[PDB]
From a paper:
To protect themselves from host attack, numerous jumbo bacteriophages establish a phage nucleus—a micron-scale, proteinaceous structure encompassing the replicating phage DNA.
Flexible termini and large loops mediate adaptable inter-tetramer contacts that drive shell assembly into a largely p2 symmetric lattice. In keeping with the p2 symmetry, each [name] tetramer forms four unique interfaces, two of which form channels: a Diamond channel at the center of the core tetramer, an Open Hairpin channel and a Closed Hairpin interface forming the lateral contacts between core tetramers, and a Loop interface where the outer corners of four tetramers meet. The Open Hairpin channel and Closed Hairpin interface are located at the lateral interface of two core tetramers. These lateral interactions are established by the same β-hairpins making contact with different residues of the neighboring tetramers, approximately 20 Å apart. At the Open interface, the tips of opposing β-hairpins (residues 111–126) interact with residues near where the C-terminus leaves the structured acetyltransferase-like domain of the neighbors. The Loop interface appears to be, in part, held together by interactions between the large flexible loops (residues 272–291) from at least two different subunits. We further show that the lattice assembles through interactions between flexible loops and establishes a negatively charged interior surface for the phage nucleus.
Numbering used by the authors:
A (entry chain E): 591 to 602
B (entry chain A): 19 to 275, 288 to 555
C (entry chain B): 205 to 275, 288 to 403
D (entry chain C): 19 to 204
The structure:
């Protein structure tokens, strides 16, 4: 139902 | 207590690290050196061990690390390689499920999705700084992946290739942070060059960076842009390929309040550039995705559903479709009286004419640095940023104008499919690895041999997402033991989503509209 | 740095019948291992992301007996002898402050009469050396006390201590110029 | 592919290519080190790889390289060692011959003289420059040679001598470029 977000990088 | 790490780590070194992270470091350092000796790898970088003992993770990992200073900022790009250890159990998480008025808790092991928390990453970054000396560095996430406990560590070839691929990606991300120029149709659009493409009805699986099989019914091959009459590049031999997309088509049994009952669910399972190209960027990815669209837009995917006539062991034989149809029976497809015309009729009555395009999304896959933007684009705190990155990537391909087809803020690029994906493989009668996804709708109908009640119990498990996913995962595993066999190994899980039809319209039309014409090789069926 | 608002300490006295080993694998005698742990309130903890342990430090003590005849007091005066001082394996540093904090673990081994458990008999041993029944040779009995058998009671044990062992031990320690703590022990 | 390779070869590396060429690079590296240890050769030269999957080559080669700055010009001197492989098929020339009144075609595999074209040389120039970092250097062709497909790589003596001789030829060409005084009857 919800979207968790990990520590992505470069694009943001 | 956890704040005593500020004292614990102030000075000195210790004797520690798990047996797999120890062995993994030793083989990876060996491989680095051989790659340098053979001149395949450049000697500009470091490999590091991240310990569960020395620092704050549940699972140890090796870190593929490269660095450069970019416009005064120290930048490090890291691609973690998780090392699960079969002898080490991390305390489980409590999954409390509110089943209406009944509350029950299931305890379960943390998978790489649960392990790779935001703090897990932040701890990886801190350890690297301790190991590189770059205490003020910024660290780029190239996407964690995992090298599973199960197999023997002696496969130097694969391990070498993992380092090679991981450093490739690290160089890309330093470059793209450095402002490197994007992939575009303009680079392909020679004034004397054109594209062409075909659908491969493979009869075989394709394999990820660790050698595990990936389901594909159709491999779409986009030919190298070129033209007869161009200057030949000396005495050369090459495959005329630019890129490819791996996909499969299921037949989902879907609701209706006149359409037939099954949906042609076209699923992308992998996106690859031709092997001669080294870089992996969003523009390259996005351009290749148009390969799946053409599967149903210009050509007809339904050929992939033909039964393997003459082969007794076809677990996904189309004849099974008769169990969901009004026949409530397997269609006799073993017989000399079964024709192409009869096949088409089964589909006329059972399968909807309008294709649906969706894809897997895997934060831990071979393309994780990129998969992550497409995943965050599904929803969450940074959806707007992920979407902005994706639309920018297509505009880089076409020179602007994606926005002339649709509003990305009214039409988010990828929607959730809800039911997520359990990945794994099973062994066949000769011991080969096959994708567990084979028990799809036709697969499951043959597995139960027409027992529709058994099929529907399974089918509801794979569709009703009001049911907590742990409950669904347990029943999915129960069904594999009964129908697939006990020789089943589970691998890293993944998300699925639906590509917005307007994203698709804009990508395909925008490329065609700027003149990068592609011919179909299968000019007529 | 230890006084967390969500953190307290607690300790356990271990009476197990096994030795410790030093830095080159040689045995160390002790009767009691005093283990001091970090206990946190069950809210958010750093360990939500990792396997974790609460050991802070440990002091290993031996319980001795000094014979002090009076030509009255029970003839044997016990002592708590520190045979080793260690920090938890999590802490790489070894300093004076850490050593001193850990020493408070020996002090607490004498809470109540816990330290005297080291003087008990233990299971099934036909002829073995730390048997309290040997104490009967210095006491009026001039004989070994039948302590290893099914006819020896808890009450008889308590009586051997009441008459032969003084209830309050002397604290002392062994300082090794060449041990791993030598930088500190030499002070 | 060439329009893309400009930038998408810059980021990342791969494995692959002819195993015989990899063996040849490895035996030369071994011999190089033995020669340094025994003081037969100075550790002042580099050996690079020229390979199929990167350069679309026809035949693979090892490249022996020396460098000097001569009157301000950075100069790279090299001697390629071409490596044919009996297990690898090479594309042929289609030779149309007017045999009297009728044209017939004979196909033949390109030989080392057909493969080592001016452009092959230009790609050697560029490949070495990228591996040495001297992107604006002038490159001297010291005269290539060949290590034929047919035979055991077990003749370390021959391979050692080829390396020594290649190094010497490279030095003579730099010496010419720098104005070294000629041999004369004087």
């Amino acid at each position: 139902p919800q979207f968790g977000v990990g520590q992505g990088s470069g694009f943001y | 207590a956890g704040n005593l790490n500020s004292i614990f780590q102030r000075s000195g070194r210790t004797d520690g690290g798990d047996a797999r992270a120890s062995e993994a470091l030793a083989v990876f350092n060996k491989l680095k050196e051989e790659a340098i000796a053979q001149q395949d790898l450049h000697d500009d970088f470091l490999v590091f061990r991240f310990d569960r003992d020395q620092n704050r993770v549940g699972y140890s990992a090796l870190l593929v690390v490269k660095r450069a200073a970019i416009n005064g900022q120290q930048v490090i790009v890291t691609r973690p390689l998780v090392m699960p250890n079969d002898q080490i159990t991390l305390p489980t998480k409590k999954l409390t499920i509110q089943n209406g008025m009944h509350q029950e808790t299931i305890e379960a092991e943390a998978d790489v999705q649960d392990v790779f928390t935001t703090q897990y990453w932040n701890r990886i970054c801190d350890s690297i700084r301790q190991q590189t000396g770059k205490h003020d560095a910024m660290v780029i996430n190239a996407g964690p992946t995992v090298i599973p406990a199960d197999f023997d560590l002696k496969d130097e070839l694969v391990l070498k290739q993992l380092l090679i691929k991981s450093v490739n990606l690290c160089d890309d991300m330093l470059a793209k942070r450095s402002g490197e120029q994007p992939f575009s149709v303009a680079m392909l659009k020679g004034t004397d060059e054109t594209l062409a493409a075909r659908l491969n009805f493979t009869g075989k699986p394709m394999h990820d960076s660790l050698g595990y099989p990936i389901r594909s019914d159709i491999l779409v091959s986009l030919n190298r842009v070129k033209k007869p009459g161009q200057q030949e590049n000396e005495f050369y031999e090459a495959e005329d390929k630019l890129n490819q997309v791996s996909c499969f088509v299921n037949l989902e049994y879907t609701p209706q309040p006149q359409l037939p009952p099954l949906t042609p669910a076209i699923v992308i399972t992998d996106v690859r550039q031709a092997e001669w190209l080294k870089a992996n960027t969003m523009e390259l990815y996005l351009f290749a995705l148009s390969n799946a669209f053409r599967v149903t837009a210009n050509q007809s995917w339904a050929r992939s559903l033909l039964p393997q006539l003459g082969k007794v062991k076809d677990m996904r034989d189309i004849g099974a479709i008769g169990y969901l149809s009004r026949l409530a029976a397997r269609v006799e497809t073993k017989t000399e009286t079964f024709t192409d015309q009869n096949f088409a009729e089964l589909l006329y009555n059972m399968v909807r004419p309008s294709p649906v395009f969706m894809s897997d999304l895997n934060r831990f896959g071979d393309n994780a640095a990129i998969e992550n933007v497409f995943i965050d684009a599904l929803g969450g705190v940074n959806q707007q940023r992920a979407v902005a990155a994706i639309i920018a990537g297509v505009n880089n391909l076409i020179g602007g104008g994606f926005e002339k087809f649709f509003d990305h803020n009214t039409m988010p690029i990828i929607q959730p499919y809800g039911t997520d994906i359990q990945l794994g493989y099973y062994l066949d009668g000769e011991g080969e690895k096959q994708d567990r996804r084979d028990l799809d709708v036709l697969g499951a109908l043959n597995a139960s041999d027409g027992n529709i009640q058994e099929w529907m119990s399974w089918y509801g498990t794979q569709c009703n997402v009001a049911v907590h996913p742990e409950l669904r995962a347990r029943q999915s595993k129960n069904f594999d033991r009964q129908y697939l066999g006990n020789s089943v190994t589970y691998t890293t899980r993944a998300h699925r989503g639906i590509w917005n039809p307007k994203f698709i319209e804009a990508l395909d039309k925008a490329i065609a509209s700027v003149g990068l014409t592609v011919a179909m090789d299968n000019v007529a069926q």
